[PDB]
Subunit: 201 residues, 6 copies
């Protein structure tokens, strides 16, 4: 069958990464996966290539754009990020649900090419709290806070909203959406094709 | 703020009503409730008028039909069942999500009057298990299975499908569908209004 | 071995009583129970004397006051409510934890007679949601909201605060408070006495 | 706001480490953290510096004591261990709940400087069982068993007691204490400051 | 397809019956049920004939014994209790798992007639806690403790042992035993028949 | 006491590995462990020796067989795999429940030497699904599918059956079997020896 494509977006400091990482730890590669994006930003201490991202240089990323290799690409917080079309179409083909961690610009592009992709937006519990999480120079902090408020402007465009106040709760909300989507008729009629045959035949 | 209307259907013995009661005992009345349908069938030991059903006579049921008192109504195995429009509109306007335990016939009439409603169909894990649950004479049991096969055929008309093999597993699937529907933008926009404005 | 006394309070519509009943259905009588208060208010359909309340007449309630039969008592919206001292002392001496669903007035009188008691206050997630839950004429609803705002003002007098936005989330918070109180040294010292001596 | 300071103590072989590690795996760095202590003992296979501990040499640890750099320090099982005051005060300041894994000597020192710190003691289910866990030379085993019995002598000084018989259960007990503490009025009045305003205004 | 018969026993105050009711409220009738025993003891307030027990007179109980109506029967503290063979065989043939809340005496008679049955014995966490739960005059309480110590002595005759210290913990242990028994090859072979053939 | 010996078998692509790995992450080394088997196959990227397996060369494995060092050994998918008898008997002795991940050939050998070992078989939800998981050349895929169908032929020999459709569910089934086994009288009479004494004395 075909897996469902998920778009997950959020301002930095909403917990989106840890939520997605905690999610994957409970799902087998044959059911759920996160997509491997291409980026120009430097790998982070303890972040292997090809796994988290495909780290390429500014020129290398620019030649992929010409090659129309991207399903979408955008400039985010000083670097280029894009979704290799090959991987996404192949993984979805084997029936796997693929998670695309992307900013709102990328989300618009995908909604335009894959109308059935589902989008989830994640909001922090409050401004103060969003601020406390960001801090973890006041000039760089204000820069992240400005980008974070802009990103949140586009929340109403997504199908789902998870307010990540209490971590565990938001992690369950994220699991709950995945499961409810696999309970939809279209996917269930396929997964239980046999049984349905037996019951009506 | 209007609540969502859920349509749940299944052939007898799929475990439908015992899945709903387990769900409801986990939710307060201001969040979720189940509609109390009208019926001409005899009350079973334990059933109380107004609670499980509004048991009426064939004549009375007719009276209500003629006066458009039903959001939907239909005959299910030699008896009538209907959802009084009034009760539903009143509970929906208070923001409560309503569960409608009705057959595939009523489900259709509800889909038209409320295209926003979400419908869930429940299936037994096999025809043998179905048979077992149905048995609770070989003749009466074969006629029950006949009405079930007819119910199960309209399954594709529903948004969600739960194969209730393992009770808890299926109960968590129902709980999951309602939880996910509440995480939808339109619903969330409202209940989190002015948190998004503060942000 | 004496049990802990829990004070739970909230304005009407915060979901207080439906949070307690969900808790109690998860605990045996030798562990947790709820006190059955006395009241002069009319029994609501379903309520049974001795179970939910001990429904008495204004005269009778007065008699008990004059004879110091109440650990605490107060007038809540044109009616009297009180906790008979006797029932409580008897159940507390058997090691059972007791839940007191009472208003901010009774809570105070209980804090003095039992400084060891733990009090939990429950809040609705917003004034709109509060209003919605309260609506269950614009006049009667405004007077209900007025008595709620007055209840919510004494919230800081409580040890714990639960914002009951999502029912299950709030139910697990209550369950969590009672579980954590049982992990306290004084309580644990006793119930694990002679395990610590073996160690 | 200010996060709550936790003291967790236990005789070796009670499971205290694995409980604390399992705990952190479910909490974001912005809510819960374990403090990084200084020690003279050797790092263990697969234990990075600055993360688990700050591994220093005997002389280096001795000069920090003069510098009054420690909130507390003690000698435990042949080595020096201490809590750098800087980190603790800074992390707590950003509202984070910090866990201090320390012996009973350290616990006394902290209770004296931070009267609002909360302490949790963890006991094994029985002596035999404590013994089975220790074993994992009978001369070294008896030495750990003697130190372990001494440590347990000080249990009555802690606010909470978790009997770690069934792991999962003790892990839930440990999560349950953290959550119940964040439900206290003082911390809730701050976290929900806004809402309370709206409801009473 | 025949269901499994579970034997659950314990001394008064171990929390046995409140552990079973919590279990049953989590399972549908086509999966699990509890047998309604016969007894000569007086119905306690709330108990209903046919639901909790089949309350009969000493004469009537005798009549049934003489006519081999009991799969097992025994005297428990000055009264008779028995499991009507008929009800059990009927519910077992429908594939339902049956719970038998009976004493160590009945358990033995059941082990012989159904060697396939699984028996679970429940213990209090200590004699003090046992005493506390039992207290609900020092004389009547000492005689209760005497009958409990005698019950607890036949504990080794059971397949499983649950030390009900923490209610939820013990409830999950019961739930776990039934879930594991259902994962056994013989049971699974059947309910997953023709999935193994497709594979 | 003595821990219980578990045998877990399944055709490749049933999820058996990830289930067992997810299991261990929630159990302390003093309660549950997976046995370290000897094998001739190459270690996999990110798989340390002595931990997952004891990787030896074809000749080295052949000399262990002569030394009767194995409780069982078998040829599986092109390589030799065996269970060192030493480790198993020692770990079980300290009361630990040891998990043996082995094929059906090995399972028969163990059932013959350790009649009280408990065996769990894990089946995929369907043939198609088993196929989807395998794929992750059509000549090598058909080879795994043939071996996988053979392996499944021996399912009826095991005490338990877990159908790993929904991962989380199968993970709970696997936890549920372990716990129910520790609730058996024999093991409980030992674990609660003291209490029982007090209650009947
Ligand atoms: N179009 C497009 N866009 C793409 C693509 N790939 C990625 N993007 C976009 O690029 C951005 C991702 O950039 P990144 O550099 O990969 O960042 P990230 O790992 O996703 O995490 P962040 O942006 O920093 O925020 P986030 O808070 O979600 O992370 P988390 O790790 O949970 O953070 C934990 C939190 O805890 C705090 N914390 C840590 N320690 C703390 C302490 N002691 N006290 C208080 N708080 C503390 C931290 O400060 C942080 O807020 C996203 O906007 C994404 O959508 C693509 O292919 N296409
Ligand atoms: N259009 C419309 N339609 C409406 C409306 N209201 C109702 N309807 C339709 O009318 C029908 C309802 O008729 P009903 O007589 O009220 O039946 P019900 O209460 O819904 O229960 P069942 O038909 O038996 O099914 P169900 O499996 O869901 O019950 P459950 O509680 O799980 O049962 C437990 C199971 O366990 C078995 N069981 C019981 N005891 C057993 C034992 N000892 N051993 C083994 N199994 C045992 C039982 O046989 C049962 O299957 C449905 O098709 C419904 O959709 C309305 O307003 N409009
Ligand atoms: N000093 C003292 N004080 C005492 C003592 N005993 C009691 N009191 C005080 O007296 C008051 C209790 O009065 P009561 O008449 O007994 O009320 P109650 O049973 O406690 O229920 P409520 O006031 O309505 O609040 P609550 O929200 O907690 O109920 P809940 O069950 O969640 O309700 C469900 C919710 O859902 C709504 N709902 C219901 N149907 C709905 C529908 N169709 N759609 C939408 N919403 C719907 C309802 O309106 C309700 O809010 C409390 O303030 C208490 O503290 C005592 O001994 N001493
Ligand atoms: N004042 C002060 N004090 C400080 C400070 N920092 C640390 N300390 C103190 O120093 C001590 C910590 O020393 P450490 O060297 O860091 O030890 P640790 O990692 O904390 O673990 P242990 O002491 O060995 O015991 P624990 O049983 O709790 O660990 P765990 O990993 O769960 O163990 C798993 C268990 O399973 C067993 N196991 C393993 N395999 C087994 C097998 N096959 N069979 C049976 N059992 C098996 C193991 O043997 C072990 O018991 C503590 O007393 C701490 O309070 C500080 O800053 N200030
Ligand atoms: N052979 C055979 N035998 C059969 C058969 N049927 C029954 N029997 C045997 O007959 C006996 C049953 O007698 P019964 O009179 O029916 O008793 P029961 O309903 O089974 O309840 P108990 O004896 O009191 O024990 P249990 O602790 O299990 O109840 P629980 O509901 O947890 O109770 C809650 C606990 O909390 C305490 N409690 C209550 N209120 C309290 C308060 N305020 N404070 C503190 N504690 C309080 C209570 O005292 C109780 O311990 C059992 O030994 C059973 O095995 C049969 O067919 N055949
Ligand atoms: N006698 C004896 N026998 C022994 C001994 N030791 C081991 N054996 C036997 O040797 C075999 C083990 O060989 P191994 O090389 O160690 O393999 P393994 O790690 O156990 O995993 P596999 O055999 O490949 O299957 P499995 O599906 O169970 O793994 P998992 O990692 O869950 O797989 C994840 C799944 O997801 C799929 N996947 C991954 N990515 C996917 C994607 N994008 N889309 C769809 N599916 C995707 C993968 O393809 C895989 O099916 C077993 O048959 C075992 O019983 C011993 O001492 N004695």
């Amino acid at each position: 069958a075909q897996g469902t494509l998920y778009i997950v977006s959020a301002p930095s400091g909403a917990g989106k990464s840890s939520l997605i990482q905690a999610l994957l730890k409970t799902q087998p590669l044959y059911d759920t996966q996160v997509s491997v994006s291409h980026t120009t930003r430097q790998p982070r201490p303890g972040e292997v290539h090809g796994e988290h991202y495909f780290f390429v240089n500014h020129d290398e990323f620019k030649e992929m754009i010409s090659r129309d290799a991207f399903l979408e690409h955008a400039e985010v917080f000083g670097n280029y990020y894009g979704t290799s079309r090959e991987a996404i179409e192949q993984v979805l083909a084997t029936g796997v649900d693929v998670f695309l961690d992307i900013d709102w610009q990328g989300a618009q592009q995908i909604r335009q090419k894959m109308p059935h992709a589902r989008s989830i937006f994640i909001l922090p519990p409050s401004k103060i709290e969003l601020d406390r999480r960001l801090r973890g120079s006041e000039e760089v902090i204000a820069k992240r806070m400005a980008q974070a408020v802009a990103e949140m402007s586009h929340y109403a465009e997504y199908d789902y909203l998870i307010v990540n106040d209490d971590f565990d709760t938001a992690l369950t909300d994220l699991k709950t959406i995945i499961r409810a989507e696999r309970l939809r008729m279209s996917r269930q009629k396929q997964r239980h094709d046999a049984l349905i045959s037996k019951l009506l035949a």
